[PDB]
């Protein structure tokens, strides 16, 4: 059984923790629930750690007193189809392979599934580690609780004796790097300096061997990613988000200074050897928009190239860990600002961006966001009980599974079927425009080889490449973004029409140039 | 927000609690979750209580860290038909009135329903308090969470100015007495001497005015009836059961000495 | 009412039947249930048949005493969508037309449906008989019992006065030949010599007019295909299977000699005029793996061409009735061994194989097969009754319809939804790789015309054609195979990655050669 330690001993050296812990809703929660610090207390000085205390980062450290939230979190939504490739006619991006040719996502890009699996899915996807990591057997794919207990309880490593990224299966890639892990786990929260910069006190950084780092990580979406363990107050821990909101002064709601001030973030820094080491962002309110924006954003978490001169931008560069914190119509400016692109298209030769799940930046400015609605209202609603203590569901999933608690709790004028119908109207319309956008992108792409064989000039091809950047951006945002337009229907529509317009312009340019060579 | 107290100071006087608390699965649970002892600590000696500390007996004291058990407990099983008289042809004892004639159960004896309602149901049944206590309105019969929060949040007393047992409705009885309450609540666990014997330190006993006692009681089936709050270990608190098992030497399984 | 005949009279001449019948579980079943032999007994000699006895091959001959098995067999699974073309974006092979161009399956290839319909579906499919045979009207498509009673009770023939294969509808083919029928019916079991070789006593053979043969056939999947009618013991009757297992000595489990010996096959031959005529394969155990492998295998049942010199291989050749009895990674060797390919691709000119439903050869080596699981455990499970005599369900269908009897009977650790989720993980992953494999095959195929117009050398085109064979094989196995990887997930994955690798190699080769002509 646990035996409490004297927190006053700790508070002598840990004044920020004292301030947070004594004032918040965990003032009665003893340190032993999460730290084994006996040898540390015997050996530390005011400025030197001595022996490192052991800190629990498993989610069961919180389940101890918060079983309802834990159990809701670890539920597996079996209706969220697993390992479902997006580059298929029945999924989100039927022409993805042609359009993304040159990028690692061509090797595999599945739809998301339940949060329990985030770390294991990151480890096993064909694009990440060359097939090095696999489930121990095909039964383990169902085991959400097991994945939560730890990735290495359900996975195997093809070669524990080597730590290099390489291909073990032929049609895999090795895109994973240390920055990725920040959106899969925070088991490394005490071992990673802010932004992944090099730091004497950091075991891991942007430039680490990712296979070695992987082996040290266990748990998905730790509870403390949104809740400070010392104050129990709302927070974020993700460096890239704090960097956008606070360091760059963009605010929590970059389009609304008033809401940014009311629902702000305060950066708190922790030191090692009296040098800044790590940071968190305490929130003014329990604002799920900002909590979920730790991960559900467009980002760089990867090497790339400069738009200006094509030079390589490696993991050592700060730009390899970057939150753009820009809506679709501000993204090109944001990427030009940091002088960055992701890949060159394998057929067209265009420098292109790679977009990922920009839910937060899409939600901005929507009617829902402007009315003060937040992600949790639809995806983590309060549970309605005839008799009981209310709590917040932590099963982050589609509102279709809890329409009474989600949509219908605000939209009294609708039946469930009516609300579903409104969702589907938007998704169906948006998906139609995604498909048309892909049709036109593909038409343009297929003209590049014809133009090259016809002897069309490099000047014309470069004009078309510039159009490809925009055609790509204004399409891929929406295959990347998970709501199929629901989060911001008007923006999806305007963007996708812009994509089609750009592709059409490029098609006309290339066809005319080919015709003139003939011729 | 709760602020923890120095448990080690309490332990300088409370040695049994120290032994229980420090060894069990509540060793990290601070006393402030259940006791407001500020004035007590300022005034007590090992031999004199001084100011009485306030002890929480509401089930929400435990729901704080054990929501799953609390929420399962307070669920109302709507299929457990409520206020269903047993002395009817379609229930358990069709000829009960003839057979029980002379006993107060002839006035009303319903089937049991969900535990959330035990104390309110005891208070309002026609055989118990002469009809003195009633739900505030007929809607409140559904409110299990409300009953758990406290009986007096959902009930009324026909005459707060008197404390005698009497009939307010013609076909009622006044069978309730203080002993009954021991199977409805343990809100009185610090105010009732073992067995309900007279005791200088007991506010309530077998001979108390049951209407006055009733008014001091709120919560059904307190969580600590089965779980010691200090050790978190399994227990009973009911005097009559301890008396049978231990005092009278009958054992927990009278027909199996080994068990 | 039936009147029994004196079996001892028959046993005087039929000593193999005596031996089988007197010892097995049909020792009390009189010959009159299946044979009208009165005139035969009056006219036969020890070595000459005399008048031919009439043998019942309708399934109702067995339903008489085995109603439960009959009724389960004839059930129509309405959820098995009928006449559903595979070459569509929502089915198994979205790019099948491009990839299979040159082959008769381009005319129509639907998903399988319930067994009751196998013979009628063979007769009416657009690729088989030029549209000659059709349902009497569109209502008859529902009539499983009717199809079982006989094909010609529910079908019409456009021209009873001619027996040639020809097109009656414009977009049909005439691919059917006598070998096909062996996997649709065994009504011809006494009229077809082993392998379909020419034989004095055979009415039908590989070289027969298929339209004439068709008209003589009635019943699907006769009960006696798996159960000897004389001993009631387990067997196979399909010549090609016996040829692989016994004649070629490959065994019932070619990858496991021990299991092959324990679960073997004994070839029993019947003569006409004291010349070998037909054969059956008695099984040591009631092994559904081998029973179902009568049909759910990759085979030749068709003319083709030699790999060595391109010469025609006609129906007269033994190779026109052949079970390869090889896994996907052994198939190229098996086809080279018999010097055979199916068609030349209409665009690339590559000699290609045509694969069909290799379920048996895929299942080998899977975790399930290695643990002693067999087809019936998932597709013909025992029926669970609260009170009753257990029998084996003969409704061969997806285990999704009987998860308690199938998966969950072995996998106690799972709920139904969890087991379904495990299936879907595999199928979704496998289907994604099928789609990607098709993407790369199509990319390669489309380069052939460009390369030809560019003047790329025949040597380079032939190199690419050799790659096409492999790219094709390692893809088409999995669109042909019905489990979408579930039967052997690891093999599907390795094969499909090999397909993509081969196509990519060919794309690079062709693009480089085109570029060099330009450059
Ligand atoms: C002064 C003598 C200290 C005592 C008393 C305690 N800690 Fe400590 N700790 C101390 C230092 C100088 C550091 C390094 C960081 C810094 O503030 O300079 C630490 C670090 C920790 C950590 C972080 C460990 C990691 O992996 O990075 C933890 C979790 C921690 N300390 C906990 C802790 C506890 C629970 C204590 C009371 C039981 C405690 N510390 C006492 C210095 C001192
Ligand atoms: C029992 C010993 C606890 C452990 C272990 C954890 N928490 Fe806790 N938490 C506990 C209490 C008694 C309370 C106060 C309840 C109240 O409503 O007063 C809390 C509260 C929280 C909250 C709510 C915070 C708020 O400001 O409203 C959160 C978000 C929370 N706790 C989270 C949390 C996490 C993430 C834990 C693991 C790191 C964790 N708690 C452990 C008791 C206990
Ligand atoms: C936070 C800014 C992220 C970073 C950094 C990385 N990922 Fe991610 N990932 C993130 C979210 C919010 C989601 C769910 C929404 C979605 O669109 O999928 C994902 C999902 C994945 C998955 C599962 C789906 C799939 O693509 O197959 C995988 C396998 C995955 N992510 C891998 C991955 C890799 C290799 C990364 C570094 C190169 C990486 N992620 C970074 C959020 C974030
Ligand atoms: C961000 C993605 C979250 C993670 C990770 C966890 N929780 Fe959470 N929690 C989150 C939100 C948006 C809310 C509601 C805030 C509001 O005021 O509306 C909560 C709330 C809680 C609480 C408070 C009680 C309740 O409302 O249920 C607790 C005790 C809590 N969360 C616990 C908890 C645990 C144990 C987690 C890991 C299993 C966990 N949270 C993760 C957002 C996020
Ligand atoms: C000695 C100086 C004491 C200290 C320090 C604390 N308590 Fe105490 N307590 C003391 C006495 C002499 C008594 C009377 C009963 C007895 O054992 O003789 C008490 C009583 C209590 C009670 C029971 C109150 C009731 O309703 O009957 C409680 C719940 C209690 N004490 C709690 C408590 C706490 C939590 C303390 C530390 C904060 C504490 N006591 C200190 C003597 C002394
Ligand atoms: C949070 C501050 C708590 C309060 C308030 C209560 N309990 Fe508790 N309890 C808490 C913890 C951290 C644990 C240990 C969990 C573990 O498995 O290690 C417990 C445990 C219990 C148990 C199980 C005990 C055992 O098996 O020995 C019980 C029965 C229990 N708790 C009951 C309980 C009651 C009835 C409470 C109100 C009087 C109560 N707990 C409050 C944390 C917290
Ligand atoms: C524990 C030994 C008990 C004592 C003392 C009293 N009651 Fe009780 N009561 C007890 C149980 C276990 C049950 C549920 C099972 C059942 O058979 O009903 C009850 C139920 C009631 C009810 C509800 C059902 C009904 O009879 O209408 C009422 C109204 C009730 N009890 C009243 C009551 C009175 C007035 C008591 C003292 C005279 C009394 N109970 C004592 C357990 C125990
Ligand atoms: C609106 C036209 C009503 C309809 C239809 C139903 N009820 Fe009603 N009820 C209504 C009002 C305005 C009130 C008074 C509310 C208050 O607190 O002032 C009620 C009251 C009841 C009660 C309590 C009766 C009592 O205490 O004497 C009950 C048990 C009740 N209502 C139940 C109920 C049922 C089950 C209904 C459908 C059969 C129903 N009501 C319809 C208004 C309206
Ligand atoms: C010897 C005089 C025979 C008697 C008595 C019976 N049969 Fe016969 N049968 C005989 C011969 C020589 C042959 C040809 C094959 C051979 O073994 O040489 C047959 C053939 C049959 C067949 C096959 C018919 C077909 O279509 O190929 C059957 C089904 C058959 N015989 C059945 C049968 C029965 C049921 C008899 C007793 C009533 C019986 N035969 C007697 C020779 C002789
Ligand atoms: C009644 C006159 C029968 C006819 C017609 C058919 N079968 Fe039969 N069968 C019958 C009996 C009395 C038995 C024995 C039952 C037992 O369990 O002892 C059987 C058995 C079978 C078996 C089981 C064989 C085994 O070795 O376990 C099978 C597979 C079987 N029968 C199949 C079968 C077929 C395919 C029939 C039509 C050709 C057929 N039977 C007819 C009785 C009768
Ligand atoms: C056994 C080795 C077979 C031979 C010889 C032929 N077919 Fe077949 N066929 C077989 C199976 C096991 C299945 C079901 C599984 C599947 O993948 O479909 C089928 C199915 C058909 C169908 C229905 C589905 C479709 O393709 O439309 C038809 C129309 C069909 N088969 C026709 C057919 C023809 C024309 C054949 C000779 C050229 C032929 N089959 C041979 C097994 C076997
Ligand atoms: C009565 C007003 C009808 C309604 C309503 C439906 N059907 Fe019908 N159908 C009707 C007749 C008189 C016939 C001809 C029957 C005959 O054998 O002479 C039919 C035929 C069909 C067919 C066959 C079509 C063909 O072969 O070309 C089909 C497939 C059919 N009917 C299906 C069907 C469906 C599914 C209906 C609801 C959508 C339906 N029919 C309605 C009369 C009537
Ligand atoms: C191969 C594709 C089969 C065909 C055709 C038929 N049956 Fe079958 N049968 C098959 C299997 C795999 C089994 C189970 C074997 C085992 O021991 O596990 C059976 C079993 C029977 C039995 C035995 C009793 C029982 O288990 O149900 C009987 C009587 C039987 N089969 C009858 C039967 C009939 C009447 C058929 C045509 C409708 C038929 N079988 C076809 C495999 C195959
Ligand atoms: C008993 C006759 C089985 C039936 C019916 C099903 N499965 Fe099975 N399965 C069985 C065994 C003995 C094993 C190996 C267990 C071990 O850990 O040694 C399995 C394995 C699987 C697997 C893992 C496959 C792999 O890793 O390659 C899966 C995904 C699986 N089983 C699923 C499954 C499904 C969904 C079933 C119904 C369609 C099913 N099994 C039936 C035994 C038996
Ligand atoms: O209190 S923290 O800064 O060590
Ligand atoms: O790869 S992750 O960003 O979706
Ligand atoms: O007995 S059989 O060989 O005619
Ligand atoms: O054509 S049959 O083999 O599927
Ligand atoms: Ca999903
Ligand atoms: Ca990006
Ligand atoms: Ca009841
Ligand atoms: Ca089917
Ligand atoms: Ca073939
Ligand atoms: Na979904
Ligand atoms: Na609002
Ligand atoms: Na094209
Ligand atoms: Na009941
Ligand atoms: Na199907
Ligand atoms: Na086994």
> What letter would DSSP give residue C1?
-
| Min Cα–Cα distance to chain C from A4, Å | 38
Q: Find residue A281's DSSP bridge partners.
A: A236, A267
Q: Where are the beta strands (DSSP E) in A291-399?
A: 299-301, 304-305, 312-313, 321-323, 343-344, 351-352
* Cβ proximity of C273 and C267 under 8 Å: no
Per-residue DSSP letters for C107-122?
G--BPP--GGGHHHHH
Q: Does A405 touch chain B (CB under 8 A)?
A: no
- Please state the residue numbers annotated as binding site of B for heme: 10, 13-14, 26, 31, 34-35, 40, 62, 65-66, 115, 180, 183-184, 223, 226-227, 230
Enumerate the residues of chain B whose CB falls inside 8 A of the CB of residue A65: 64-66
How far is residue B221's CA from residue B147's CA, in Å, rounded to a whole number? 11
Cβ <8 Å between C436 and A81: no
Q: Is B61 on the interface with A (CB under 8 A)?
A: no
Resolution (in Å) of the shown entry?
Answer: 1.4
Note the CATH number of domain C414-519.
1.20.140.10
The residue among C185, C109, C174, C181 whose CA lies nearest residue C147 is C185
Rounded to the nearest 5°, which phi and psi values hold at A35? -135, 135
C327 contacts: CB under 8 Å, gap ≥ 6? C255, C361, C362, C364, C365, C491
Q: Does A435 touch chain C (CB under 8 A)?
A: no
On chain B, the residues whose CB falls within 8 A of the CB of A385 are: 71, 145
A47 alpha carbon – ligand 26 mean position (Å): 67
The set of protein residues with a Cβ atom below 6 angstroms from ligand 17 is C 14-17, 270
Alpha helices in A169-318 (DSSP H): 210-215, 239-242, 257-262, 288-292
Number of the ligand 18 atom closest to the C-alpha atom of C357? 4
The CATH number given to C59-413 is 1.10.1130.10
Contacts of A345 (CB under 8 A, 6+ apart): A101, A102, A352, A445, A468, A472
Spatial neighbors of C157 by CB under 8 A, at least 6 apart, are: C132, C133, C215
CA A437 to each of CA A78, A335, C244: distance values in angstroms, whole numbers, following the listed order: 31, 22, 53
Could you give the CA distance from residue C192 to residue C279 in angstroms, rounded to a whole number? 10
The residue among A74, A78, A518 with the most chain C CBs within 10 A of its CB, best to mutate, is: A78
| Preferred mutation among C366, C412, C422, C437 to probe A, highest tally of A CBs within 10 A | C422
The CA angle A504-A508-A509, to the nearest 5 degrees, is 115
Other beta carbons within 10 angstroms of residue A110's beta carbon come to: 21
**What angle, 0 to 180 degrees and rounded to 10, lies between the N-to-C axes of helices A489-517 and A328-338?**
60
Nearest CA residue ID for atom 30, ligand 6: B232
Facing A171 at nearest CB: one of C431, C454, C501 = C501
> Architecture of domain B1-58 in CATH?
Orthogonal Bundle (1.10)
The C-alpha torsion from A359 through A360 and A365 to A371, rounded to 10°, is: 100
Do A294 and A301 contact (CB within 8 A), yes or no? Answer: no
CA dihedral of C213, C219, C223, C225, whole degrees rounded to 10: 20
How far is A20 from C244, CA to CA, in rounded Å? 77
User: Any idea what the Cα angle at residue A125 is, between residues A124 and A129, rounded to 5°?
Assistant: 70
Element (H, E) at A420: helix A416-454
Give, for A431, the enclosing helix (H) or strand (E).
Answer: helix A416-454
Q: How many CB atoms are closer than 10 A to CB B138?
A: 8
Is C191 buried (19+), middle (13-18) or exposed (0-12) by CB count in 10 A? middle
Residues with Cβ within 8 Å of residue A432, at least 6 apart in sequence: none
CA distances from A226 to A57, A66, A288, A290, C254 (A): 13, 14, 9, 9, 57
Distances (CA, A) of A422 to A92, A418, A455, B242, C503: 19, 6, 50, 63, 44
Which atom of ligand 1 is nearest to A6's Cα? Answer: 38
Check if the beta carbon of residue A177 is closer than 8 Å to that of residue A141.
no
Distance, CA of A199 to CA of A272 (rounded, Å): 9
Ligand 28 centroid vs A94 CA: distance in angstroms? Answer: 22
What sign for the dihedral angle of Cα A27, A32, A34, A39?
Answer: positive
Q: Nearest CA to CA, how far is A299 from chain C (Å)?
A: 26
Asked whether the beta carbons of residue A25 and residue B1 sit closer than 8 angstroms, the reply is yes
Spacing of C-alpha C157 from chain mean position: 25
Residue in chain A nearest C486 by alpha carbon? A138
What SS3 class is residue A123? helix
* Helical ranges in A110-205 per DSSP H: 118-124, 144-149
Neighbouring CB atoms inside 10 A of A20's CB total 20
Q: Answer whether A59-413 and A414-519 agree in fold.
A: no
Cα distance between residue C456 and residue C517, in whole Å: 7
DSSP A26-64: TTTS-GGGTEE-HHHHHH--SS---SPPEE--STHHHHT
* Chain A residues within an 8 Å CB radius of C435: 85, 87-89
Q: Rounded to whole angstroms, how far apart are CA atoms C194 and C198?
A: 9
Partners of C367 on chain A (C-beta within 8 Å) are: 137-138
Q: Which residues contact C73 (CB under 8 A, 6 or more apart)?
A: C59, C115, C116, C221, C223, C394, C395, C396
Q: Do chains C and B touch (3 or more CB pairs under 8 A)?
A: no
Question: Closest chain A residue to B145 measured between Cα atoms?
Answer: A387
Asked whether the beta carbons of residue A3 and residue B60 sit closer than 8 angstroms, the reply is no
Cβ contact B75:A388 at 8 Å? yes
**How far apart (Å, rounded) are the C-alpha atoms in residues A512 and A504?**
12
A34 lines ligand 1 (CB under 6 A): no
What is the CB-side half-sphere exposure of residue A35 using CA atoms within 13 A?
18
Encode C120-129: b = buried (16+ Cβ within 10 Å), e = exposed.
bbbbbbbbbb
Scan residues 266-285 of A and list those with Cβ closer than 8 Å to C.
none
Cα(C298)–Cα(C334) distance, rounded to whole angstroms? 11
Residue A281 has a CB neighbour count (10 Å cut-off) of: 23
Can you say which residues of C are annotated as belonging to the binding site for Ca(2+)? Answer: 298-299, 354, 356
Distance, first Cα to last Cα, chain A: 87
**∠ CA A179-A185-A190 to the nearest 5 degrees?**
80
8 A C-beta contact, residue A475 and residue A88:
no
- For residues B145 and B126, give the distance between their C-alpha atoms in angstroms, rounded to a whole number: 23
Contact indicator for C125, C110 with CB cutoff of 8 Å: yes
Neighbours of A439 (CB within 10 A): 14
Does A68 lie at the interface with C, CB-CB under 8 angstroms? Answer: no
User: What contacts 24+ positions apart, CB below 8 Å, involve B58-63?
Assistant: B58/B149, B58/B150, B58/B218, B58/B219, B59/B148, B59/B219, B59/B222, B59/B223, B60/A389, B60/B149, B61/B33, B61/B34, B61/B223, B62/B223, B62/B224, B63/A389
Which residues hold their Cβ within 5 A of ligand 23, which is an ion?
C 354, 356
Q: Are strands C321-323 and C343-344 parallel, antiparallel or unpaired?
A: unpaired
Question: What angle, rounded to 10 degrees, do the helices at C416-454 and C458-480 form?
Answer: 160
Method: X-ray
* Domain ranges across chain A: 1-58, 59-413, 414-519
User: Is A302 near ligand 3, meaning CB less than 6 Å away?
Assistant: yes
- Considering only CB atoms, B2 lies closest to which of A4, A28, A30, namely A28
The values of phi and psi at residue C204, to 5°, are: -125, 150
Report which ligand 12 atom has the smallest distance to the Cα of C137.
26
CA distance A330 to C246: 71
Which regions of chain B does DSSP assign to beta strands (E)?
Answer: 35-36, 54-55, 133-135, 155-157
Question: C344 and C102 in contact (C-beta within 8 Å)?
Answer: yes
A38 Cβ contact list (under 8 Å, min separation 6): A5
Asked if A28 and B27 come within 8 Å (Cβ–Cβ), the reply is: no
C-alpha span between C357 and C361 (Å, rounded): 9
Q: With CA atoms as reference, report the closest residue to A7 among B61, B14, B33, B7.
A: B7
């Amino acid at each position: 059984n646990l035996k409490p330690v004297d927190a006053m001993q700790c508070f002598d050296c840990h004044t920020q923790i004292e301030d947070m812990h004594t004032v918040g809703k965990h003032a009665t929660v003893n340190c032993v629930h999460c730290h084994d610090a006996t040898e540390h207390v015997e050996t530390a000085s005011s400025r030197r750690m001595g022996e490192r205390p052991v800190t629990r980062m498993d989610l069961e450290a919180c389940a101890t007193c918060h079983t309802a939230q834990f159990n809701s979190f670890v539920e597996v939504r079996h209706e969220s189809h697993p390992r479902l490739e997006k580059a298929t006619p029945t999924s989100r991006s039927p022409m993805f392979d042609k359009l993304i040719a040159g990028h690692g996502f061509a090797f595999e890009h599945a739809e998301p599934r339940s949060h329990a699996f985030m770390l294991v899915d990151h480890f096993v996807v064909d694009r990440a580690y060359g097939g090095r990591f696999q489930f121990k057997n095909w039964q383990k794919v169902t085991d959400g609780m097991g994945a939560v207990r730890g990735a290495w309880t359900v996975l195997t490593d093809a070669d524990p004796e080597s730590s290099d990224q390489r291909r073990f299966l032929s049609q895999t890639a090795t895109a994973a790097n240390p920055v990725c892990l920040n959106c899969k786990t925070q088991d490394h929260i005490l071992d990673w300096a802010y932004m992944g910069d090099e730091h004497e006190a950091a075991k891991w950084s942007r430039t680490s061997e990712v296979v070695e780092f992987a082996r040290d990580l266990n748990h998905p979406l730790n509870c403390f990613m949104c809740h400070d363990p010392h104050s129990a107050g709302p927070r974020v821990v993700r460096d890239g988000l704090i960097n956008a909101v606070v360091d760059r002064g963009l605010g929590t709601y970059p389009h609304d200074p008033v809401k940014s001030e009311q629902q702000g973030m305060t950066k708190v820094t922790f030191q090692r050897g009296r040098e800044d080491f790590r940071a968190i962002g305490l929130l003014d309110t329990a604002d799920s928009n900002v909590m979920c924006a730790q991960c559900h954003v467009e980002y760089n978490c990867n090497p790339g190239y400069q738009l200006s001169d094509g030079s390589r931008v490696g993991m050592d560069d700060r730009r390899a860990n970057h939150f753009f914190w820009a809506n679709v119509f501000d993204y090109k400016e944001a990427a030009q600002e940091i002088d960055f692109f992701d890949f060159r298209h394998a057929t067209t030769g265009a420098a292109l961006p790679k977009l990922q799940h920009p839910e937060a930046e899409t939600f901005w400015g929507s009617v829902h966001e402007r009315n003060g609605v937040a992600c949790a209202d639809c995806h983590m609603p309060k549970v309605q009980l005839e008799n009981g203590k209310v709590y917040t569901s932590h099963s982050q999933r589609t509102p279709r599974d809890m329409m009474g608690q989600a949509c219908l709790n605000c939209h009294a004028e609708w039946t469930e079927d009516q609300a579903l119908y409104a969702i589907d109207y938007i998704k169906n319309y948006t998906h139609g425009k995604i498909v048309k956008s892909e049709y036109w992108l593909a038409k343009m792409i297929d003209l590049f080889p014809v133009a090259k064989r016809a002897g069309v000039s490099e000047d014309v091809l470069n004009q078309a490449r510039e159009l490809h950047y925009d055609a790509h951006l204004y399409w891929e945002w929406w295959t990347a973004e998970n709501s199929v337009g629901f989060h911001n229907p008007d923006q999806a529509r305007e963007s996708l029409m812009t994509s089609i317009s750009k592709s059409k312009e490029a098609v006309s340019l290339l066809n005319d140039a080919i015709d003139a060579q003939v011729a």
